[PDB]
Amino acid sequence: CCLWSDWINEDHPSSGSDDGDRETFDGVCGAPEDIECRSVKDPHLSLEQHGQKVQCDVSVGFICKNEDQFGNGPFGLCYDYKIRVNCCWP
């Protein structure tokens, strides 16, 4: 019993106050096995085909910072991301 979770889009670039986009897995699971890191409005692109610089690991979750996206495109904003987590149940 190691079913995947749902998609969690609980933050936005044009809202919030964390100056970017951060998606964490609290309220669902404690220590995951795997994490999937995709975008909302075009979900087949990898993280290397967006060109933005993020970190998305099983330890803390997802982090995008708007200050890191300076000089990359002409807009300088995070895209809208969403995540799954994989957790095993007895």
Binding site: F70, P74, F75, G76
Partner: protein
């Protein structure tokens, strides 16, 4: 001493809000009140104190009734709850920043974008002085203008002094060597990107040369209501600064300022109801990232947020950055004008050039370093020979290459310490005997 009563009015005079009961739309009930006189202490914490014991307040401190204070242009004493203020003499400053941002003597900031010589300030009597200034296009379009030449017509308008935008001060079409001290005015150059001009009439000039050319003019308050130009008339009101020299107040800045052309063959200019950060998409992200440092508090600009309120410098910083063709010279000029107008109110920004505009900090020579408080009277030992002739107090400190707290400047090159400085006649070395042995600064004569 809040005594309890029945049937008394809830509208109490409270030692800051006096005379409440004249606007009292309530009936009376019971509760704890004041006696017949003896208004309630609001500012402190006591009860129904007498009226002539009301402690004043001024952004915090609980001033006792009688403690004076020295404010901006006035001094005030705490009377019974209210301040009694009395005026002190204080000057006024017209500024011409960017290519086109005029700030008059009475506030009133406006944008013009001209192409002519313009009368910036002139004395009204028949002669006294006249300060001109060229505001011509420097970039590609007509909306990319720059200051290029400052012309001063002083000493009954028979002496013309010209400040070109490469140094090159020239009197009556002839180059001069700086310093140049005369009977009626004097021109200094303390930091090679800064020229300081003082006049005996009451006019002081500061010409900035890098990154872009800018101008700062200072008048005494004796000349109040006695000047005309693009700097207004300096009378306290800013509604009549757009009043032309033929009657009536104009509406827009470019309609007022076409009446002060110094040449008749100049065309008339008009306003521009656009913003440059929409016409250029590549410049508007660079403008947002770097001019936002005036508003965030992690930087060394949040120290000035208690005094200067950067919300109007931020709007001009985005304006000039998106508009001009060399975007970093307009960024660093607009960041050095917030730091300039913050040192005018005490708070000096030591070291704001470490992440943003430090392309000239480390380029100082071998002995002298980059300073933020360079002034005229930190000069060589030749200035110590006069020591009361040319010091010219009343200006503002500027930032350039200079020597530390000791080791004054020699005749050329590095700055040696005080013992073997010079003996200034020609500046002799530290081995000459007249009977005056050459010594540290002073001479044994």
């Amino acid at each position: 001493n809040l005594v309890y009563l029945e049937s008394g009015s809830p509208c109490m005079d409270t030692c800051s809000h006096l005379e409440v009961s004249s606007l009292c739309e309530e009936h009376r009930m019971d509760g704890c009140f004041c006696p017949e006189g003896t208004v309630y202490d609001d500012i402190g914490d006591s009860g129904c104190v007498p009226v002539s014991q009301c402690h004043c307040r001024l952004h915090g401190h609980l001033y006792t009734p009688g403690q004076e204070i020295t404010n901006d242009c006035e001094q005030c004493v705490c009377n019974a709850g209210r301040w009694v203020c009395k005026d002190l003499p204080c000057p006024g400053t017209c500024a011409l920043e960017g290519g086109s941002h005029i700030t008059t003597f009475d506030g009133k900031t406006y944008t013009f974008h001209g192409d002519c010589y313009y009368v910036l300030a002139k004395g009204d009597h028949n002669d006294s002085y006249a300060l001109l200034g060229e505001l011509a296009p420097c970039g590609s379009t007509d909306k990319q203008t720059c200051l290029k030449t400052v012309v001063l017509l002083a000493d009954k308008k028979k002496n013309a002094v010209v400040f070109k935008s490469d140094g090159s001060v020239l009197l009556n079409q002839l180059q001069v060597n700086l310093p140049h001290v005369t009977a009626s005015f004097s021109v200094f150059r303390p930091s090679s990107y800064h020229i300081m001009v003082s006049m005996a009439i009451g006019v002081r000039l500061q010409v900035q040369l890098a990154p872009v050319m800018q101008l700062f003019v200072t008048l005494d308050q004796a000349s109040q209501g006695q000047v005309q130009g693009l700097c207004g008339n300096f009378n306290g009101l800013e509604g009549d600064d757009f009043k032309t020299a033929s009657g009536l107040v104009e509406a827009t800045g470019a309609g007022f300022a076409n009446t002060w052309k110094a040449q008749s063959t100049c065309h008339d200019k008009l306003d521009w109801l656009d913003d440059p950060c929409s016409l250029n998409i590549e410049s508007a992200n660079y403008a947002e990232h770097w001019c936002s440092l005036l508003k965030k508090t992690e930087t060394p600009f949040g120290r000035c947020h208690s005094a200067v309120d950067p919300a109007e410098y931020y709007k001009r910083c985005k304006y000039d950055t998106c508009n001009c063709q060399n975007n970093e010279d307009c960024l660093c000029a607009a960041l050095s004008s917030y730091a300039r107008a913050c040192t005018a109110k005490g708070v000096m920004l030591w070291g704001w050039r470490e992440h943003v505009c430090n392309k000239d900090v480390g380029s100082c020579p071998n002995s002298q370093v980059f300073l933020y408080n360079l002034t005229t009277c930190q000069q060589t030992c030749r200035s110590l020979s006069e020591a009361d002739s040319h010091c010219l107090e009343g200006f503002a400190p500027v930032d350039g290459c200079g020597c530390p707290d000791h080791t004054f400047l020699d005749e050329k090159g590095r700055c040696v310490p005080l013992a073997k400085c010079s003996c200034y006649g020609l500046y002799l070395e530290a081995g000459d005997v007249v009977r005056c042995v050459c010594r540290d600064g002073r001479l044994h004569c």
